Amino acid sequence: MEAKAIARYVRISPRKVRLVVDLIRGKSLEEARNILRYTNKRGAYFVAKVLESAAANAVNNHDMLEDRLYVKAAYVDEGPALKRVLPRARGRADIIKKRTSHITVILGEKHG
Template identity: 75%
Template sequence: MERKRLKKGERSDIRKDLRDVHYPGSAGLIRYAKMSLEQRSQALKEETPHTYALARARYVRMSPRKVRRVIDLIRGKSLEEARAILKYSPHRAAEVVAKVLESAAANGINDDRKNMLEDRMYVKAAFVDEGPALKRVLPRARGSAHMIKKRTSHITIIVGERNG
């Protein structure tokens, strides 16, 4: 089989297929996490709303980088396993992420259209976006000052239901 050489702007068929995958498999999740905010919202609108439940915590006063450490631990795990990981995680962000996870699970269970079962739920996607930063001034020697950015995060967790 002869390999076709691609020109600079072209993508292979495999890459084109991967571009359209939002959730299944690790490649799809990584692709989804790297999407811009507009692309994410478009991807969620295209998927039928009865297959997932979503919860968001916005303007959380924690650095997105520190929250991502915790989010990466639970992505793709079952609901029960994710709860256990967050319960025993030493990070401060684990408490906030646990609240968002519980909210997403409750949204899936209590919505009449979704009617999800708790024992079949899993973390379909989880990501953290950077919110606005609070800028503060720290006085330094000889009358100078340094800027401190107190960062905020927007945490989003999407739970789905596994078949079987």
């Protein structure tokens, strides 16, 4: 049994969040919570909410046990980028891409 949460269109660049997600992949829910709590990254806030929301789904919707949950899979996909104009010298305009993330946490039950 699996329980999933997806935070779509989070306004953080995928590459940067993936760093944080990479940390908790394959971890127990409890270790992941602890790791996230002291990860000095903006991304740790968002991953935490998805982790935490995936947990709730496991318990509330999916007859899974909180004491048994681990991060089965987790990944970040790119959402549509917010393109923004960055004014440069000599009349030139760059386009900054304020990138966007879809954050997915999938929890499984580690039995016993």
